[PDB]
């Protein structure tokens, strides 16, 4: 039971607590409702209510009652994780991959221009609709929560930027570009790019593909908190082996999203101008709800 909602249904375990599909009692509208497992965060998250962009899941409300905290979002019917699983036999068509990447970059460019990072992008917080839109959920929450324990559930590391895995306590816009590059690669190949089981397995999967980073490609890397001079030194592989059959435009863009040094990583705004998007369109997905 809930005072202000009816037909409340669990839909997932999230970074911060249970996520429900719920119907507002007064209006009948269907929303996603994210009970935070437990004020500097309430004011800061409440600022996120002001943000509106077509590629960002609207934060409709912040409800603080009975010493509980709930976030109310507009509801979308499928996430990219489920869509990629449903699309595993055929693959997502390239024009739709390109459309989704373009739209996600517009959402990131918007948030970043408003000084809001995500820090934890992953297919589970990318939501799609029947009209061909994709939207990013949960921007700004990681900073407000303070990176921080809000679930006992197993955290996905697969999309974490190397700066994060090497113990850098200082985030930048580049962490979100890394995560989206990993998601791009996964849409293309139908396999996660770096499916690490632990922080060190995550870090070593990255190193085995992109080469072990050094001061030449990443000035400052050897001073990062969790950097170890004893890390094995892997040579770097070609993106042509990693994301076939992606064309050279897509591989060029992906390589710019996956530079080791966050400062060298392409921005969302610059990525939107990349030649890969010259022929972008907005196709209709085949969604089975
Ligand atoms: O909480 C998490 O970490 C991800 C997560 C998990 C489950 C649902 C969401 N969000 C939304 C938003 C809108 N329509 C549907 N689901 C996010």
Coordinates of C-alpha atoms and ligand atoms in Angstrom, one line a residue:
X1 CA 0.0 0.0 0.0
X2 CA 1.0 3.7 -0.6
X3 CA -1.0 6.8 0.4
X4 CA -0.5 8.6 -2.9
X5 CA -0.2 5.7 -5.5
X6 CA -2.1 2.6 -6.4
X7 CA -1.3 -0.5 -8.5
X8 CA 2.3 -0.3 -7.3
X9 CA 4.5 -3.1 -8.9
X10 CA 8.3 -3.9 -8.4
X11 CA 10.2 -3.5 -11.8
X12 CA 13.9 -3.7 -10.7
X13 CA 16.6 -3.4 -8.1
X14 CA 18.5 -0.1 -8.7
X15 CA 21.8 1.6 -7.5
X16 CA 19.7 3.2 -4.7
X17 CA 16.8 0.9 -3.9
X18 CA 13.8 -0.8 -5.3
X19 CA 12.3 0.7 -8.6
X20 CA 8.5 0.4 -9.0
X21 CA 5.9 1.0 -11.7
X22 CA 3.2 2.9 -9.9
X23 CA -0.1 4.8 -10.7
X24 CA -0.6 8.2 -9.2
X25 CA -3.8 8.0 -7.1
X26 CA -5.0 11.6 -8.0
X27 CA -4.1 11.7 -11.7
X28 CA -4.0 8.0 -12.9
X29 CA -0.6 8.5 -14.6
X30 CA 1.9 5.7 -14.6
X31 CA 5.4 6.6 -13.3
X32 CA 8.6 5.0 -12.2
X33 CA 9.0 5.3 -8.5
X34 CA 12.6 4.8 -6.9
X35 CA 12.5 4.2 -3.2
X36 CA 15.9 5.4 -1.8
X37 CA 17.3 2.8 0.7
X38 CA 18.3 4.8 3.8
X39 CA 19.3 17.6 3.8
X40 CA 22.0 18.2 1.1
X41 CA 20.8 15.5 -1.3
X42 CA 17.1 16.6 -1.3
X43 CA 17.8 20.2 -2.4
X44 CA 20.4 19.1 -4.9
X45 CA 18.3 16.3 -6.5
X46 CA 15.3 18.7 -6.4
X47 CA 17.3 21.0 -8.7
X48 CA 17.3 18.2 -11.3
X49 CA 13.4 18.5 -11.5
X50 CA 14.1 21.7 -13.5
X51 CA 16.0 19.9 -16.3
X52 CA 14.1 18.9 -19.5
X53 CA 15.5 17.4 -22.6
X54 CA 14.1 14.9 -25.1
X55 CA 16.9 12.4 -24.3
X56 CA 16.8 12.7 -20.5
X57 CA 14.1 10.8 -18.4
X58 CA 12.2 13.5 -16.7
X59 CA 12.5 13.7 -12.9
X60 CA 8.8 14.6 -12.1
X61 CA 9.1 14.8 -8.3
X62 CA 11.1 14.3 -5.1
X63 CA 8.8 13.0 -2.3
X64 CA 10.1 13.1 1.3
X65 CA 7.4 11.8 3.6
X66 CA 7.3 9.5 6.7
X67 CA 11.2 9.9 6.8
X68 CA 11.3 8.0 3.5
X69 CA 12.6 9.4 0.1
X70 CA 11.2 8.6 -3.3
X71 CA 12.1 9.9 -6.7
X72 CA 9.3 10.0 -9.3
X73 CA 10.3 9.7 -13.0
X74 CA 8.3 9.5 -16.2
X75 CA 7.8 5.9 -17.1
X76 CA 9.2 4.2 -20.2
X77 CA 8.4 0.6 -21.1
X78 CA 11.8 -1.0 -21.9
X79 CA 15.5 -0.4 -21.1
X80 CA 18.4 -0.9 -23.6
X81 CA 19.6 -4.0 -21.6
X82 CA 16.3 -5.8 -22.4
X83 CA 16.2 -4.5 -26.0
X84 CA 19.8 -5.7 -26.7
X85 CA 18.8 -9.2 -25.2
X86 CA 15.6 -9.3 -27.3
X87 CA 17.8 -8.2 -30.4
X88 CA 20.6 -10.8 -29.8
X89 CA 19.7 -13.1 -32.7
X90 CA 19.6 -10.4 -35.4
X91 CA 21.5 -7.5 -33.8
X92 CA 20.1 -4.0 -33.5
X93 CA 20.2 -2.6 -37.1
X94 CA 23.1 -0.1 -37.6
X95 CA 20.8 2.8 -38.4
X96 CA 19.1 2.4 -35.1
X97 CA 22.4 2.0 -33.2
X98 CA 23.5 5.2 -34.8
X99 CA 20.2 7.0 -33.9
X100 CA 20.5 5.8 -30.3
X101 CA 24.1 6.8 -30.0
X102 CA 23.4 10.3 -31.5
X103 CA 20.4 10.8 -29.1
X104 CA 22.4 9.6 -26.1
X105 CA 25.2 12.1 -27.0
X106 CA 22.6 14.9 -27.2
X107 CA 21.4 14.0 -23.7
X108 CA 24.9 13.9 -22.3
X109 CA 25.8 17.2 -24.1
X110 CA 22.7 18.8 -22.4
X111 CA 23.5 17.5 -19.0
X112 CA 27.2 18.3 -19.2
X113 CA 26.4 21.9 -20.4
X114 CA 24.3 22.2 -17.2
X115 CA 27.2 21.0 -15.1
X116 CA 25.5 17.6 -14.3
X117 CA 27.3 14.3 -14.7
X118 CA 25.9 10.8 -14.6
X119 CA 28.9 8.8 -13.4
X120 CA 27.1 5.4 -13.7
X121 CA 25.7 5.0 -17.2
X122 CA 24.7 1.6 -18.1
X123 CA 22.1 -0.1 -20.4
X124 CA 19.7 -0.5 -17.4
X125 CA 19.4 3.3 -17.1
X126 CA 18.9 3.9 -20.9
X127 CA 15.2 3.8 -21.6
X128 CA 13.5 3.5 -25.0
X129 CA 10.0 4.1 -26.4
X130 CA 8.0 3.0 -29.4
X131 CA 8.7 6.2 -31.4
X132 CA 12.5 5.6 -31.7
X133 CA 13.6 7.8 -28.8
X134 CA 16.1 6.8 -26.1
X135 CA 16.6 8.6 -22.9
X136 CA 19.1 8.7 -20.0
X137 CA 17.8 8.1 -16.5
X138 CA 19.5 9.0 -13.1
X139 CA 21.8 11.9 -14.2
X140 CA 23.0 13.9 -11.2
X141 CA 22.1 11.3 -8.5
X142 CA 25.6 9.9 -7.9
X143 CA 27.0 13.3 -7.0
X144 CA 24.0 14.1 -4.7
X145 CA 24.2 10.7 -3.0
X146 CA 28.0 11.1 -2.7
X147 CA 29.3 8.1 -4.6
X148 CA 27.5 6.1 -0.9
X149 CA 26.2 2.5 0.0
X150 CA 22.5 2.3 -1.0
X151 CA 22.3 -1.4 -2.1
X152 CA 23.7 -4.7 -0.9
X153 CA 23.1 -5.9 -4.6
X154 CA 26.0 -6.7 -7.0
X155 CA 27.3 -3.5 -8.9
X156 CA 28.0 -3.7 -12.6
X157 CA 31.6 -2.4 -13.2
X158 CA 31.5 -3.0 -17.0
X159 CA 31.0 0.6 -18.0
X160 CA 33.4 2.2 -15.4
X161 CA 36.0 4.6 -16.7
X162 CA 39.7 3.6 -16.0
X163 CA 40.2 6.8 -14.0
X164 CA 37.4 5.5 -11.7
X165 CA 38.9 2.0 -11.4
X166 CA 42.4 3.5 -10.6
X167 CA 40.9 5.2 -7.5
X168 CA 40.7 8.8 -8.8
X169 CA 38.3 10.6 -6.3
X170 CA 37.8 13.4 -9.1
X171 CA 35.1 12.9 -11.7
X172 CA 34.7 14.7 -15.1
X173 CA 32.4 14.6 -18.1
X174 CA 34.8 12.1 -19.6
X175 CA 33.6 9.3 -17.3
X176 CA 30.2 9.4 -19.1
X177 CA 31.8 9.4 -22.6
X178 CA 33.7 6.2 -21.6
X179 CA 30.6 4.5 -20.5
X180 CA 28.7 5.4 -23.6
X181 CA 31.6 4.2 -25.7
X182 CA 31.3 0.8 -24.0
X183 CA 27.6 0.8 -24.6
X184 CA 28.1 1.7 -28.3
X185 CA 30.5 -1.3 -28.7
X186 CA 28.0 -3.6 -27.0
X187 CA 25.2 -2.6 -29.3
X188 CA 27.4 -3.3 -32.4
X189 CA 29.0 -6.6 -31.3
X190 CA 26.1 -8.0 -29.2
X191 CA 28.6 -8.7 -26.4
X192 CA 29.8 -6.4 -23.5
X193 CA 33.1 -4.9 -24.3
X194 CA 34.7 -5.2 -20.9
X195 CA 32.6 -7.6 -18.7
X196 CA 34.8 -7.5 -15.6
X197 CA 33.9 -9.6 -12.5
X198 CA 35.9 -7.4 -10.1
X199 CA 37.7 -4.0 -10.2
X200 CA 41.0 -5.6 -11.1
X201 CA 39.5 -8.0 -13.7
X202 CA 37.7 -4.9 -15.1
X203 CA 41.0 -3.0 -15.3
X204 CA 42.9 -5.9 -16.8
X205 CA 40.2 -6.5 -19.4
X206 CA 40.6 -2.9 -20.5
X207 CA 44.4 -3.2 -20.5
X208 CA 44.4 -6.4 -22.5
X209 CA 42.3 -4.7 -25.3
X210 CA 43.7 -1.1 -25.2
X211 CA 47.2 -1.9 -23.9
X212 CA 48.4 -1.1 -20.4
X213 CA 48.4 2.7 -20.0
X214 CA 51.6 4.6 -19.5
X215 CA 52.8 8.2 -19.0
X216 CA 53.1 8.6 -22.8
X217 CA 49.4 8.0 -23.5
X218 CA 48.1 9.2 -20.1
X219 CA 50.3 11.7 -18.3
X220 CA 49.8 11.3 -14.6
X221 CA 48.5 7.7 -14.7
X222 CA 51.4 6.3 -12.7
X223 CA 50.5 8.6 -9.7
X224 CA 46.8 7.5 -9.6
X225 CA 45.8 6.2 -6.2
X226 CA 45.4 2.5 -7.1
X227 CA 48.0 2.4 -9.9
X228 CA 50.6 -0.4 -9.3
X229 CA 54.0 -0.4 -11.1
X230 CA 53.6 -4.2 -11.0
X231 CA 50.6 -4.2 -13.4
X232 CA 51.3 -6.5 -16.4
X233 CA 52.2 -4.6 -19.6
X234 CA 49.8 -5.7 -22.4
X235 CA 50.2 -4.5 -25.9
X236 CA 47.1 -2.7 -27.4
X237 CA 44.8 -4.4 -30.0
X238 CA 43.2 -2.8 -33.1
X239 CA 39.5 -1.6 -32.9
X240 CA 39.1 -3.5 -36.2
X241 CA 39.4 -6.8 -34.2
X242 CA 37.3 -5.5 -31.3
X243 CA 34.1 -4.1 -32.9
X244 CA 33.8 -5.7 -36.4
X245 CA 31.9 -5.1 -38.6
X246 CA 31.7 -1.4 -37.5
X247 CA 33.0 0.8 -40.3
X248 CA 36.0 3.1 -40.0
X249 CA 33.8 6.1 -39.1
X250 CA 32.3 4.2 -36.2
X251 CA 35.7 2.8 -35.1
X252 CA 37.3 6.3 -35.2
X253 CA 34.5 7.7 -33.0
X254 CA 34.7 4.8 -30.6
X255 CA 38.5 5.2 -30.3
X256 CA 38.0 8.9 -29.4
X257 CA 35.5 7.9 -26.7
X258 CA 37.9 5.3 -25.2
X259 CA 41.1 7.3 -24.9
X260 CA 42.7 6.5 -21.6
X261 CA 43.4 10.1 -20.6
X262 CA 40.0 11.6 -19.7
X263 CA 41.3 14.9 -21.0
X264 CA 41.8 13.5 -24.5
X265 CA 38.4 11.8 -24.7
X266 CA 36.0 13.4 -27.2
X267 CA 33.3 15.6 -25.7
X268 CA 29.6 14.8 -26.3
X269 CA 29.3 18.1 -28.3
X270 CA 32.3 17.3 -30.5
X271 CA 31.1 13.7 -31.0
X272 CA 27.8 14.9 -32.4
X273 CA 29.8 16.5 -35.3
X274 CA 31.8 13.3 -36.1
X275 CA 31.5 12.0 -39.7
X276 CA 29.8 8.9 -38.3
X277 CA 26.6 10.9 -37.9
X278 CA 26.5 12.5 -41.4
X279 CA 23.8 10.0 -42.4
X280 CA 22.0 9.7 -39.1
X281 CA 18.2 9.1 -39.1
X282 CA 15.6 8.2 -36.5
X283 CA 14.2 4.7 -37.3
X284 CA 11.3 2.9 -35.5
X285 CA 12.5 0.0 -33.2
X286 CA 10.7 -3.3 -33.0
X287 CA 9.6 -3.3 -29.3
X288 CA 7.9 -6.4 -27.8
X289 CA 6.2 -5.1 -24.6
Ligands
LIG1 O1 17.9 2.4 -10.4 C1 18.8 2.0 -11.2 O2 20.0 1.9 -10.9 C2 18.4 1.7 -12.7 C3 17.0 1.6 -13.0 C4 16.3 0.4 -12.8 C5 14.9 0.3 -13.1 C6 14.3 1.4 -13.6 C7 14.9 2.6 -13.8 N1 14.3 3.8 -14.3 C8 13.2 3.9 -15.1 C9 12.8 5.2 -15.4 C10 11.7 5.3 -16.2 N2 11.0 4.2 -16.7 C11 11.5 3.0 -16.3 N3 12.5 2.8 -15.5 C12 16.3 2.7 -13.5

